[PDB]
């Protein structure tokens, strides 16, 4: 901090030589002293200001050109950099650059030289009444300036070639004793106020306002430690907050001014000075029921809308096609001991019971990839050790029930509170990317099976599948997939468009995926010659291998006797499957129940975990797959019932009818075979691409990844942008991308069942390693639950 | 100075003519693809020995579908690069250049 000496200088003309020069007008040491005509300094007075002066000072400071810590020691440099930043910020035109530096480089006169010039008169720059203070204080320095003081120069001029008033605020890195202008103390700050004639603009009053602002201690300190124009603006707003206006009044002027003393003294007083642990057994479960089940009546009445029916038609295919595909693989890898029919019936029953009883009915319950990998591994283990795979599954279920009852009993689902937005978004982005990759690899496999060839064997066997390449199959599949994706996205855009009466637009855009599916299925149906792969459901509700097992499996064995040791050794695979289902379902519930998604009905973690794992364990007895809350399906369900207002999410149709109807349709899918046999897989591939793309909307990781490819100026007004440095946020995003790559490598590795543990290892990263390289404010701005 | 009669052609006739010509252009562009599909229809069986000179003398597999794929891909990439020119991504001088090309 340093004491200040402000100097106001104006562009004038002399009578003797008619030469433009800068003339002393006023100076500030402790109070304002004005220089009048005849060269006598006036009486020191308080620096009163006019209303318009502070008006236009704030106006031109808002668009001000601010240079801080400028490394110049002469006026000519300060003048060249300023006139340059003037051009850079488009304050002035490049043509008037010269004339303005020709003006700024004129001689600076002072009080002693006024008499020798034969008078001084006001002047206006060309491209080629007396002041109130003079009238009231002027008609009739080195000792006062403190030794450790620095000076401010306020340059005020009128230039008719400028289009707008321009403010330039320059702070020097080192205080410089300029040669062009002589002062008792070195110049640090430099105010430049130039512009044309404008209404309500007295440039003398603008300079007086700027000098009074620089004479104030708080603003002087703020300008000393300012690093941007915003800090200077905020200090100016604080200055104007303490500014007091005296309206024209008839009160006796001595008392009128003396009444303002306590108002000033007060005005300057401060200027200068669901996952909580209860501890009760099954407390989380009973709290879950208490929170969700009161809304059961609304869960049936909120479903009476066409959006719910469109969501049913969407999620029906979105849950049936994975069921059919995973049924083919589970069977082809299990010798059909678990196949399409078992998976369909298990999906239907568990979905019906979950929609009827669950606390987050918008979750979609079904088979998944990690469960398929575990089934592969367990079947291989049973084949190696001469074991019965289905009985081992029965015993794995028995242990999963004891596990979910114990974790629900001790409120083990309170540990989900430590999975922050970091792990949630990493898992969501990874799952969406994997979904898109699998969807594209299916089309690649279709192209591989029927490549583009010059010649084809026209007599090929079609049953059960074509025994060789077929013409036009792969190209038509690509066309169908692209057309379905295109139509779905166009109808999604049309839902938010300005076209057609709103109701019909919002009902047509609500039925976007069903209309796209219908259109593309009709297109394929009218193309008869070209073959395309269709959906294939089993013949009837029968087990996939009647020669292997029945509908119920004896825990002691079917064709042999299950060994005693495996009944106890089943805990470890049960532990792994419990970890898989727990992590997947709990993170899915975290994602679908974010506060930003407008979920106002509440979600249940303990109750949903109990229902899912217990139903899986019970279905294991019937030799049926255990299910998990799939992330893509549940996110698509939540988005399909999400209502968008006049953009911004308004509400979500939280109801139990949509999931129940999806489960019922999945169970009935065997019966509705003549309709499902005319639906190509390419249409559903386009639908899967739509789901994978649309699942990326609410993930901040995807937005931050998109920011790395955007100029640091188009970054949105979000707290992780406006409060965090750009490269810091980019480093955060890059660390997340490294985690994504590590998890992707783990997935493609035969140790893909360890993916939950590598995902879990991100929580210690965020809570231990990230504070070592980021500050707390950065981490709260970058990793916020809401 | 018989070209001064053009001043009586207002935005009415100008816009009618331009819209009609654009509609005709799009119509012929689509009818060429329709003719491609007609020349090489989607069939269960094709003769694998078709004389190619000067033009194919019969239906060929994967021709019309690939032509439709190429047309759609060209239109898609052209429109997406036009959108990217006005977009907010990449250093600006590149986004502009890339969008010009
Ligand atoms: C079957 C539907 C139409 C059949 C008859 C066609 C004739 C027909 O129905 O006219 C209705 C409408 C004019 O009537 P009007 O201006 O009253 O209708 C406005 C329209 O529905 C907006 O969508 C509404 O805003 P939003 O979006 O809800 O926010 C707005 O209400 P709000 O702003 O106060 O809330 C409504 O007032 O015309 C068209 O939209 C042109 C498309 C005609 C093409 C018809 C497409 C087939
Ligand atoms: C592959 C490209 C090679 C670049 C390698 C990466 C290295 C690299 O070049 O980035 C730095 C630079 C940012 O620098 P900076 O923000 O200063 O550059 C601004 C940017 O070019 C804007 O696009 C310009 O506005 P507009 O939009 O033209 O109107 C703006 O001009 P103006 O407003 O002042 O007149 C420029 O100031 O580029 C990016 O945009 C960042 C996105 C990087 C993504 C690049 C993709 C990796
Ligand atoms: C149903 O299960 C039986 C027995 O598990 C399968 O019969 C086996 O088939 C495999 C494949 O060749 C071989 O191990 C033997 O031929 C059979 N082994 C036994 C012990 O019978 C039958 O293939 C299964 N059905 C289907 C459709 O996979
Ligand atoms: C945690 C779940 C899986 C239950 C716990 C399993 C263990 C502790 C218990 C539960 C039921 C028990 C079995 C019940 C019946 C029989 C038949 C008998 O002739 C020999 C012992 C045997 C085979 C028992 C062995 C131990 C057993 C498997």
Give the topology, please:
This is part of a larger assembly, with two copies of chain A.
Chain A: E1 3-14, E2 20-28, E3 32-34, H1 51-62, E4 65-70, H2 75-88, H3 96-104, E5 120-122, H4 132-137, E6 149-156, E7 166-176, E8 187-194, H5 203-215, H6 217-224, H7 229-241, H8 253-258, H9 260-267, H10 283-292, H11 298-301, H12 306-334, H13 340-357, E9 364-366, H14 369-384, H15 389-409, H16 421-449, H17 473-495, H18 502-510, H19 512-525, H20 564-569, H21 571-592, H22 605-621, E10 628-630, H23 631-640, E11 642-644, E12 649-652, H24 657-668, H25 673-676, H26 681-694, H27 700-707, H28 719-722, H29 726-748, H30 755-760, H31 762-773, H32 776-782
Parallel strand pairs in A: 1-6, 4-7, 6-8
Antiparallel strand pairs in A: 1-2, 1-5, 2-3, 7-8, 9-10, 11-12
Helix pairs in contact in A: 1-5, 1-7, 2-3, 6-7, 12-13, 12-14, 12-23, 12-24, 13-22, 13-24, 15-21, 15-22, 16-17, 16-21, 16-26, 16-29, 17-18, 17-19, 17-26, 21-22, 21-23, 27-29
The structure holds ligand PIO (2 copies), a molecule of 2 linked components (NAG-NAG) and cholesterol (CLR).
């Amino acid at each position: 901090t340093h004491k200040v000496y402000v100097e106001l200088q104006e562009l004038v003309m002399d009578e003797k030589n008619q030469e433009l020069r800068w003339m002393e007008a006023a100076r500030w040491v402790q109070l304002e002293e004005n220089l009048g005509e005849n060269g006598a300094w006036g009486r020191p007075h308080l620096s009163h200001l006019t209303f318009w002066s502070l008006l236009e000072l704030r106006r031109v400071f808002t668009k001000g050109t601010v240079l801080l810590d400028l490394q110049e020691t002469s006026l000519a440099g300060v003048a060249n950099q300023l006139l340059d930043r003037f051009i850079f910020e488009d304050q002035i035109r490049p043509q008037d650059r010269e004339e303005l530096l020709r003006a700024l480089l004129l001689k600076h006169s002072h009080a002693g030289e006024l008499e020798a010039l034969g008078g001084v008169k006001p002047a206006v720059l060309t491209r080629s009444h007396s002041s109130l203070e003079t009238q009231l204080f002027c008609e009739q320095i080195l000792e006062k300036i403190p030794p450790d003081s620095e000076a401010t120069l306020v340059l005020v001029g009128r230039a008719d070639f400028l289009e707008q008033p321009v403010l330039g605020f320059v702070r020097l890195q080192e205080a410089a004793e300029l040669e062009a202008v002589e002062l008792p103390v070195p110049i640090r700050f430099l105010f430049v106020l130039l512009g044309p004639e404008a209404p309500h603009i007295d440039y003398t009053q603008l300079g007086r306002a700027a000098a009074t602002l620089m004479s104030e201690r708080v603003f002087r300190i703020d300008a000393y430690m300012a690093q941007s124009r915003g800090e200077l603006l905020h200090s100016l707003e604080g200055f104007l907050d303490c500014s007091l206006v005296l309206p024209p009044t008839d009160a006796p002027s001595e008392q009128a001014l003396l009444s303002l003393v306590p108002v000033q003294r007060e005005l300057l007083r401060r200027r200068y000075q669901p996952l909580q642990q209860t501890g009760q057994l099954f407390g989380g479960l009973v709290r879950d029921i208490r929170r969700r089940y009161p809304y059961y009546l609304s869960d049936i009445t909120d479903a009476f809308s066409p959006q719910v029916l469109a969501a049913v038609i969407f999620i029906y295919f979105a849950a049936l096609s994975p069921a059919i595909t995973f049924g083919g693989l589970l069977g082809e890898k299990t010798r059909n001991q678990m196949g399409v029919s078992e998976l369909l019936i298990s999906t239907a029953v568990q979905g019906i019971l979950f929609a009827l009883l669950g606390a987050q009915p918008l979750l979609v319950v079904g088979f998944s990839g990690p469960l398929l990998v575990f089934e592969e591994a367990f079947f291989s283990f049973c084949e190696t050790n001469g074991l019965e795979y289905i009985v081992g599954r029965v015993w794995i279920g028995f242990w999963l029930i004891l596990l979910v009852v114990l974790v629900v009993a001790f409120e083990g689902s309170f540990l989900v509170r430590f999975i922050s937005r970091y792990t949630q978004e990493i898992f969501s982005f990874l799952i969406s990317l994997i979904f898109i990759y699998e969807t594209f690899s299916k089309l690649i496999k279709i192209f591989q099976d029927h490549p583009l060839q010059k010649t084809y064997n026209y007599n090929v066997l079609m049953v059960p599948k074509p025994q060789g390449p077929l013409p036009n199959t792969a190209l038509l599949s690509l066309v169908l997939m692209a057309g379905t994706f295109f139509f779905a996205m166009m109808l999604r855009k049309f839902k938010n468009s300005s076209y057609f009466p709103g109701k019909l637009r919002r009902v047509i855009g609500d039925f976007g995926v069903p209309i796209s599916i219908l259109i593309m299925v009709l297109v394929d149906f009218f193309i008869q010659d070209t073959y395309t792969q269709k959906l294939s459901v089993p013949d009837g509700f029968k087990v996939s291998n009647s020669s292997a097992r029945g509908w119920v499996i004896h825990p002691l064995g079917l064709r042999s006797e299950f060994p005693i040791w495996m009944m106890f050794a089943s805990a470890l695979p049960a532990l792994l499957v419990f970890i898989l289902i727990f992590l997947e379902s709990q993170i899915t519930t975290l994602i679908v129940s974010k506060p930003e998604r407008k979920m106002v009905k509440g979600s249940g973690f303990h109750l949903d975990l109990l229902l899912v794992v217990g139903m899986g364990g019970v279905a294991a007895l019937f030799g049926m797959p255990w299910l998990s809350a799939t992330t893509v399906r549940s996110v698509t369900h939540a988005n399909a019932l999400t209502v968008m207002g006049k953009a911004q999410i308004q509400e979500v149709k939280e109801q139990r009818i949509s999931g129940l109807l999806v489960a019922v349709l999945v169970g009935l899918s065997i019966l509705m075979e003549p309709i499902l046999s005319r639906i190509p897989l390419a249409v559903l591939f386009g639908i899967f691409l739509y789901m994978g793309v649309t699942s990326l909307s609410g993930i901040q990781l995807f937005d931050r990844i998109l920011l790395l490819f955007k100029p640091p100026k188009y970054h949105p007004d979000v707290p992780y942008v406006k409060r965090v440095k750009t490269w810091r946020m980019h480093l955060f995003t890059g660390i997340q991308i490294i985690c994504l790559a590590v998890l992707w490598v783990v997935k493609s590795t035969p140790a893909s069942l360890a993916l939950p543990f590598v995902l879990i290892l991100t929580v210690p990263l965020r809570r231990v390693l990230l504070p070592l390289i980021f500050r707390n404010v950065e981490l709260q701005c970058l990793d916020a639950d809401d």
